Structures are given as structure tokens and as C-alpha cells.
UniProtKB/Swiss-Prot annotation, chain A:
Localization annotation: Cell membrane
Record-given protein name: ATP-binding cassette sub-family C member 8
Glycosylation site positions: N10
The organism of origin for this protein: Cricetus cricetus
Transmembrane segments: 31-47
Residues of the full protein shown: 1 to 50 of 1582
Swiss-Prot record, chain B:
Top-level division of the source organism's lineage: Eukaryota
Residues of the full protein shown: 57 to 112 of 390
Role played: Inward rectifier potassium channel that forms the pore of ATP-sensitive potassium channels (KATP), regulating potassium permeability as a function of cytoplasmic ATP and ADP concentrations in many different cells. Inward rectifier potassium channels are characterized by a greater tendency to allow potassium to flow into the cell rather than out of it. Their voltage dependence is regulated by the concentration of extracellular potassium; as external potassium is raised, the voltage range of the channel opening shifts to more positive voltages.
Modifications after synthesis and translation: Phosphorylation by MAPK1 results in changes in channel gating that destabilize the closed states and reduce the ATP sensitivity.
Segments in the Extracellular topological domain: 34-56
Subcellular locations according to the entry: Membrane
Subunit structure: Homotetramer; the homotetramer binds four ATP molecules (one ATP per subunit). Forms an heterooctamer with ABCC8/SUR1; one KCNJ11 homotetramer interacts with four ABCC8/SUR1 molecules. Interacts with ABCC9/SUR2.
Protein name: ATP-sensitive inward rectifier potassium channel 11
Membrane-spanning residues: 11-33
UniProt family annotation: Belongs to the inward rectifier-type potassium channel (TC 1.A.2.1) family. KCNJ11 subfamily.
Source organism per UniProt: Rattus norvegicus
Length: 50, 56
């Protein structure tokens, strides 16, 4: 039972991005993660120079 | 604006913080992108099929 961004239940079959990737109830969450991990890692050097 | 003046000015422990954090932030951001794209193609779903993954 290793860690998982989505849910390993249903014998780990929830990653199927079919029926459109945007209709993946988990992938949209990943897209929302991206802007946060973009700002943090474009500002950390600037905040540290400060 | 004169960023590269500041980077030389700073002390060695602070310079190593900037050093380490620049590299690690770059590594982790691009790791996020690799994760997302190889997930969009479906290569993350286990036993999806014979579809050749875009990154093995
Ligand atoms: C009368 C004519 C005037 C000029 C007219 C030009 C017309 C051009 C049209 C518009 C194009 C401009 C595009 C700029 C957009 C980005 C600007 C930016 O980020 O820099 C902004 C600043 C300073 O630069 P500036 O104030 O713009 O200088 C230009 C101007 N001539 C000036 O000197 O005023 O830059 C900084 O202050 C940079 C700090 C450097 C610190 C080092 C770390 C960088 C952080 C990002 C990476 C971090 C590391 C992690 C890697 C992640 C990988 C994605
Ligand atoms: C209490 C809060 C107060 C806040 C005030 C300011 C904070 C300053 C902190 C001061 C204490 C820091 C203790 C750090 C212990 C290690 C020091 C070290 O390795 O440097 C050894 C030397 C330099 O000596 P220095 O004393 O750092 O000199 C700085 C001086 N002030 C100057 O400006 O000159 O370094 C060199 O001359 C470079 C040799 C490098 C050779 C090998 C590289 C080792 C590091 C490589 C990076 C490793 C990163 C690992 C990250 C892992 C992340 C998971
Ligand atoms: C360089 C930085 C890294 C790359 C950024 C992420 C790349 C992948 C983005 C994919 C994405 O937004 O989804 C597409 C829809 O977006 C769009 O249609 C664009 C608008 C929504 C995002 C902004 C898929 O496209 P689709 O819905 O046709 O995919 C299903 C049929 N294959
Ligand atoms: C879970 O994955 C399976 C296959 O991708 C699908 O449905 C499963 O299969 C059995 C047999 O048809 C169904 O009765 C169940 O609904 C599912 N099994 C289990 C253990 O739940 C479907 O894609 C997914 N279903 C759900 C509810 O997540």
C-alpha cells in the first residue's frame, strides 16, 4: 500500500484518464497543484536574495 | 535589479542556501511537469496496455 496522489482503492484503477483527461476526477486536482508549485519555485530565490 | 551583485555579496552559508534551493526548486518544478505529462498520456496507470509510454 504505497502512497498515492489519487486513491489506490478499486485495485488501483482510478488513473485511467480516458473519457477526456479533464474529466478525470483526480487529474484536475493535479492541474490546480501546478500554479502553486510554479510560484513557490519562481519566488524562493527572490525571497532568499531578500 | 543588480541581482548578481547581491549574490556575490552574500555570505557563504547564504550563498549555499541559494545554490541548493535554486537547483532543487528547478529539479522539483520540472519533476512536477514530467509527472503531469506522463500522467496525461496514461503511462502512470498500471497495466494500461501496449501503448508505448512517452517516458518509460
Ligand atoms: C524606454 C525603454 C525602456 C525599455 C523598453 C523595453 C520594451 C520591452 C517590452 C516588454 C518585454 C519585457 C519582458 C520582461 C518580463 C520579465 C521581467 C523580469 O522578470 O525582470 C524584471 C527585473 C528587472 O528587469 P526590468 O526592470 O524589466 O529591466 C528592463 C528595463 N530596461 C529596466 O532596466 O528597467 O528582473 C529582475 O529583478 C530579475 C532578478 C534576477 C534574480 C535571479 C533569479 C530569477 C528568478 C526566476 C528563476 C529562479 C530560479 C528557479 C528556476 C525555475 C525555472 C522556471
Ligand atoms: C543563528 C542565526 C544567525 C543568522 C546570521 C547569518 C547566518 C549565517 C550562518 C553561520 C553559521 C553557519 C554554519 C554552517 C556550517 C558549515 C559552513 C561551511 O561549510 O562553510 C565553510 C566555508 C566558509 O566558512 P563560513 O564560516 O561559512 O564563512 C562565511 C563567512 N561569513 C564569509 O562570508 O566568508 O565554505 C567554503 O569556503 C566553501 C567550501 C565548500 C566545499 C564543499 C561544499 C559543502 C556544501 C555543499 C552544499 C551542500 C548542501 C546540502 C543540502 C541538502 C538538502 C537536503
Ligand atoms: C511548459 C509547462 C508544462 C506544460 C503544461 C501542462 C501541459 C498539459 C496540459 C493539458 C491540459 O491543460 O489539458 C488539455 C486541455 O487544455 C485545454 O484545452 C487548454 C485550456 C485549459 C488549460 C489552461 C487536454 O486537451 P483535451 O481536453 O483535448 O485532452 C483530452 C483528449 N486527448
Ligand atoms: C473500478 O475498476 C473496475 C475496472 O476498471 C470497474 O468496475 C469494477 O469491476 C466490477 C466487475 O464489473 C464491478 O462490479 C465493480 O464496480 C468494480 N470493482 C470493484 C471492486 O469495485 C470500474 O472502472 C471501477 N468502479 C468503481 C466503482 O470504481
Amino acid at each position: 500500500m504505497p502512497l498515492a496522489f489519487c486513491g489506490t482503492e478499486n485495485h488501483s484503477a482510478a488513473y485511467r484518464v480516458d473519457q477526456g483527461v479533464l474529466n478525470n476526477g483526480c487529474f484536475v486536482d493535479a492541474l490546480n497543484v501546478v500554479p502553486h508549485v510554479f510560484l513557490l519555485f519562481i519566488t524562493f530565490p527572490i525571497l532568499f536574495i531578500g | 535589479q543588480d541581482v548578481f551583485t547581491t549574490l556575490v555579496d552574500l555570505k557563504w552559508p547564504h550563498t549555499l542556501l541559494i545554490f541548493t534551493m535554486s537547483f532543487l526548486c528547478s529539479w522539483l518544478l520540472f519533476a512536477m511537469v514530467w509527472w503531469l505529462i506522463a500522467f496525461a498520456h496514461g503511462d502512470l496507470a498500471p497495466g494500461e496496455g501496449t501503448n508505448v509510454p512517452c517516458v518509460t
